[PDB]
Design a protein around this ligand. Structure first.
Ligand SMILES: O[C@@H]1[C@@H](O)[C@@H](O)OC[C@@H]1O
Ligand SMILES: O[C@@H]1[C@@H](O)[C@@H](O)OC[C@@H]1O
Ligand code: NA
Lengths: 339, 346
């Protein structure tokens, strides 16, 4: 079934329930996922109204872009030219700059295919917006099916050469409660390398590091507490994880990661080369989710995209988008329950 | 009463009814007026869904900006600096550029004050959007009261020195039918001068001309047909009216314009210096409004703003907005019945 309701400030909440009784819900405010629940338990973090996102934290569940992550000094080179983007975290451009696409109301259309239902959000980023050349016509399609698969499909076309590398910022918490650390979750991740951070500013350090046989090697399922209790300077630097992991094998058919808690597991698939993992290292911040005070490590992301820092480490890839080329990206979060 | 429902594409329709029974409705798509009815008759032009605006004509009833009108070659000078804005009409920047504010979903909140209901729409124009320095935090409040006054109040604050001069693009048609020309309406307008356009590109000619005693003189009420039938160069150039009229006396207290048909009148008040009047000179385009094919001259706007062309004619005003400085503008459209005797035939 599909249900639409006012979510506040003019935004809508679109809720989809599949044959299995699973419920996923989205909002046009930032083309974002608000909730995902089974047998009355939330699997992800989210608020109860649009206002909360705007007042508390606008990132959770959102489509962030045009470029996800931190860009050093807000500087990108486009066709040999330097461009300075909006700086909203010191001199860095973080998540597209201030008042970015995650804070705008996107238009949308719902398509019911029976076994699958799609919600297509659209937004136009005007040329020059936050320093980005455009116009960029963007669309993010969130779909949910009877097999419990939640798919995100991105598309974009720009009038001018520009940069483009968005991501979905959902935070998972299989505890179904923010006051509970995800340290008890087990994680498996098909990556043998990562990108270390320079320092507290979180810009990249400059190198690519082999993680095999370290507290961060999750090639084999392991409990998060491990990483969390690690003494690796990188863990100690951010007080958890807040890094880009490089996938060993690319392609949508490969399960790239898996988050497990008891009977319940989330599998991640993507056509992207990297997954940025952030473990809600907010300390005592205590953001309120459903009346529950969030704890340090009370969430974890799987931001699939081209690794941040390609400006300094070209091996990471290239986020350029040439005029007229069609950008496409796909990320899938599949839900399973052991019998 | 206040009612709300989805209007299409994720936009909403907000419908108000005052104690007199008059109904007016707005959409967050472009902080825009959708309809205004008296006794079941439309007083303005509008569509029945969001998609129509997007597919037919996205300007009607909309909030347009950040700068309303045409800017020659998209060139503005901001604090000694030259800036080129998005050019969407040939080399011209028309109504803020392509995919401007009238095309966005604004957030909003409704305030019920009893005799008055306010709908405040908000949007942020990011720094650099369409070439405009910012960021600009904007807000448009549309309100309707028991006295049948529909008021528009604009507010804005920029992080950087920029330009700002928005307007409301409603189209009136007291016939309540797009297929009926407004040549039968009576118009009274407190303006002695106008701004001629250079040519078909519609940029300003460069001079200000006195229109007293010509077919464009509406100081004393006259039928619109007088203008439409005129062979004055300016009328012929645009095939009707599409010009800024400079108000003779400024201030929100004064009735600047009055449009009448039979027993119905719409009065215009504003704190702005000019009113740009466009009479839907679309020829045979025939855009469908409620299944009625619109006729040439099937509508008239009263876009109150600082006149377009100030870039070339400094005398017109200055639309610059300094960083941190609060912009405010107020325009009011009031509805009246039997304000005067208007009994004509066409
Ligand atoms: O530092 C993290 C960033 O890496 C990402 O995960 O989004 C949230 C935080 O700002
Ligand atoms: O030419 C007119 C313009 O002057 C304004 O009134 O909006 C509609 C058309 O673009
Ligand atoms: Na809505």
């Amino acid at each position: 079934s599909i249900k639409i309701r006012d979510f506040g400030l003019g935004s809508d909440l679109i809720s989809l329930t599949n044959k299995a009784g699973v419920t996923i819900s989205f909002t046009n405010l930032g083309a974002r996922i608000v909730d995902w629940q089974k047998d009355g338990k939330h699997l992800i973090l989210g608020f109860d109204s649009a206002k909360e996102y705007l007042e508390k934290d606008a990132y959770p569940g959102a489509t962030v872009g045009p470029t996800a992550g931190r860009i050093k000094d807000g500087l990108v080179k486009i066709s040999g030219k330097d461009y300075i983007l909006n700086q909203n975290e010191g001199p860095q451009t973080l998540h597209g700059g201030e008042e970015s696409i995650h804070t705008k109301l996107w238009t949308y259309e719902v398509t019911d295919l029976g076994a699958e239902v799609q919600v297509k959000f659209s937004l136009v980023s005007n040329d020059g917006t936050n320093g980005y050349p455009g116009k960029i016509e963007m669309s993010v399609t969130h779909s949910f099916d009877d097999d419990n698969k939640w798919k995100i499909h991105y598309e974009a076309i720009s009038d001018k050469d520009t940069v483009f590398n968005p991501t979905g910022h959902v935070y998972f918490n299989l505890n179904g409660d923010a006051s509970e650390s995800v340290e008890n979750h087990g994680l498996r991740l098909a990556a043998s390398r990562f990108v270390p951070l320079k320092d507290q500013t979180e810009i990249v350090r400059g190198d690519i590091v082999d993680i095999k046989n370290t507290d961060l090697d999750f090639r084999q399922e392991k409990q998060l507490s491990n990483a969390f209790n690690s003494n690796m300077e990188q863990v100690q630097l951010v007080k958890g994880i807040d890094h880009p992991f490089l996938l060993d094998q690319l392609g949508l058919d490969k399960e790239q990661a898996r988050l497990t808690l008891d009977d319940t597991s989330i599998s991640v698939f993507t056509d992207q080369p990297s997954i940025v993992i952030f473990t809600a290292n907010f300390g005592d911040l205590g953001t309120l989710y459903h009346e529950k005070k969030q704890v340090h490590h009370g969430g974890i992301t799987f931001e699939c995209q081209v690794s941040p820092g390609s400006e300094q480490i070209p091996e990471l890839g290239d986020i350029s988008l040439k005029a007229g080329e069609k950008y496409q990206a796909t990320t899938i979060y599949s839900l399973h329950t052991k019998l």
